[PDB]
């Protein structure tokens with residue numbers, strides 16, 4: 001280790017992913033006790049990364065940590081708690097960073113439990129979706145930024161197609177995913193002009209075969225689900241490659257139409273217009 | 279094709295109507311002969327708006343003062359405003375929390391307040407107004423921004439709240455369509471407008487062509503009266519050319535087929 005030195009990221013490292021890119025990297029994965037979160041932890045362990053996983057369930061998190069170590073994780077730990085608690089969110093990052101001796105990648109993936117329903121008067125679900133799905137991500141980012149700045153790290157935000165286009169029956173959920181795009185895309189512009197070398201990856205996912213999603217859509221929505229294992233790897237790759245956005249869905253139509261080149265053109269036109277050095 | 283007669287005798291709520299775009303909407307509405315209920319925190323500024331409204335031609339004009347930080351006030355305001363007019367035809371959601379241009383560092387208080395005032399209060403107001411809007415086959419008009427469609431630095435919290443409006447209101451618009459709820463939803467995407475607040479906030483950060491507030495206010499009302507899904511208003515021809523997202527509309531249409539709505 002003391003007699004070793006160099007870099008994994010040279011020519012082509014912005015285009016071609018290699019699992020060696022995550023070897024020895026210090027990664028946090030939230031909502032990692034099941035679904036996409038757990039699959040990402042598993043891929044990270046296999047690549048030789050140090051991982052800290054979180055979710056509310058201590059028992060489920062223990063099993064993820066055990067399997068991570070079996071897979072070849074440089075180190076694997078968990079810290080259990082609710083992302084409804086902003087104090088837990090803030091303290092969780094401080095512990096996790098101490099546990100690894102820094103932080104290279106922050107993977108923000110948890111959501112509050114959501115079922116498909118027409119919106120009528122559930123303001124409690126609207127507020128909780130905004131607190132858990134959005135506000136806790138901002139709190140985690142603030143807590144992690146000093147460590148990510150020291151490592152020229154990465155923030156990976158797990159979003160949805162419902163965070164880019166309108167879908168009925170997910171109004172609160174969709175509001176919170178759209179809010180993530182607005183917030184993280186704005187700070188990405190700020191980091192660029194402020195020369196903060198921390199990348200931000202927004203992951204736009206279609207239906208994924210997680211137990212929660214398959215149960216929730218049953219008899220309501222009839223869509224093709226994509227495999228969770230492949231989903232989880234594509235999220236990691238986008239993060240490691242420092243891509244601004246990752247798109248992952250079963251439909252070839254989606255991948256063909258989801259990009260918004262006019263938004264990118266407008267942002268470039270507006271990019272000069274302001275005097276931000278004030 | 280819009281005609282000012284479309285608003286004659288209509289029962290309209292305008293929030294954040296003590297100044298800027300909101301006050302100019304109250305004026306175009308009063309001119310057209312509508313019944314209006316204006317709101318903001320400042321009692322003294324609201325009184326002046328109510329007086330000038332009556333002079334311009336309003337069927338009736340009232341104000342109810344209070345903060346949209348208070349969800350109880352938001353909910354009760356709509357019921358009181360509805361009682362004053364004996365119903366509701368149009369709900370114009372326009373207020374924002376005071377915001378200045380700044381890089382984001384650790385102001386979680388501003389992030390939460392922007393989400394509460396700019397977004398959550400609009401959802402609370404919509405829930406309170408929906409029974410009356412259903413009776414009249416009314417309209418909801420949501421005032422958003424270009425910063426609610428594309429990324430801008432120095433407005434992270436504000437932008438998050440405007441994006442949230444698009445996500446929420448575009449989703450319920452799909453639900454109303456399939457549920458046969460005849461209440462239209464208009465999302466207004468505005469560029470820089472020559473309001474005193476914006477001209478002060480941008481000073482020395484931007485020298486753009488400030489679109490006139492009077493014309494802005496009318497275009498918002500027209501979009502609402504015409505039941506348009508989205509209204510775009512900016513000084514730049516390039517903005518109007520690039521702001522639309524036809525691919526999002528195509529994707530939404532393709533995904534609609536996956537739903538079992540007979541449940």
Ligand SMILES: NC(=O)c1ccc[n+]([C@@H]2O[C@H](COP(=O)([O-])OP(=O)(O)OC[C@H]3O[C@@H](n4cnc5c(N)ncnc54)[C@H](OP(=O)(O)O)[C@@H]3O)[C@@H](O)[C@H]2O)c1
Pocket residue numbers: 030031032033034035036037054055056057060081082083084108109110111112113132158159160161205206207208209210211212213
């Ligand atoms: N599955 C899909 O079809 C799909 C599609 C698009 C986007 N996504 C996005 O992908 C992400 C993962 O979704 P998923 O389907 O993998 O979900 P999942 O299997 O239901 O997992 C949710 C995770 O978050 C945790 N969680 C729940 N409530 C929490 C709370 N209050 N505080 C902290 N953690 C909490 C859960 O464990 P605990 O209950 O023990 O805390 C679990 O670890 C979400 O951001 C979702 O929007 C998924």
Ligand SMILES: NC(=O)c1ccc[n+]([C@@H]2O[C@H](COP(=O)([O-])OP(=O)(O)OC[C@H]3O[C@@H](n4cnc5c(N)ncnc54)[C@H](OP(=O)(O)O)[C@@H]3O)[C@@H](O)[C@H]2O)c1
Pocket residue numbers: 293294295296297298299300317318319320323344345346347372373374375376395421422423424468469470471472473474475476
């Ligand atoms: N001006 C622009 O360039 C521009 C561009 C794009 C979008 N927009 C959107 O257009 C709308 C109007 O903007 P504007 O420039 O006309 O703003 P403005 O002149 O500053 O007016 C804001 C209004 O909201 C009220 N308000 C503020 N805080 C409130 C609170 N806590 N509770 C209740 N009401 C509150 C204010 O009155 P009190 O202070 O007396 O409460 C005032 O009537 C906003 O939704 C804004 O995002 C404006």
Ligand SMILES: O=C(C[C@]1(c2ccccc2)[C@H]2C[C@H]3C[C@@H]1C[C@@H](C2)[C@@H]3O)N1CC(O)C1
Pocket residue numbers: 113114115116160161162167170173205206207208212213216217221
């Ligand atoms: O975001 C998701 C997945 C979910 C969904 C499922 C159908 C329709 C909208 C949302 C699943 C069901 C609810 C809402 C949301 C998040 C999870 C899983 C939650 O349990 N999609 C699929 C679409 O392509 C974007």
Ligand SMILES: O=C(C[C@]1(c2ccccc2)[C@H]2C[C@H]3C[C@@H]1C[C@@H](C2)[C@@H]3O)N1CC(O)C1
Pocket residue numbers: 376377378379423424425430433436468469470471475476479480484
């Ligand atoms: O949303 C607005 C107007 C505002 C703004 C001003 C420059 C840049 C971003 C935001 C004005 C200054 C702040 C933030 C926000 C809302 C008001 C007026 C607030 O006082 N724009 C103009 C741009 O095209 C989209």
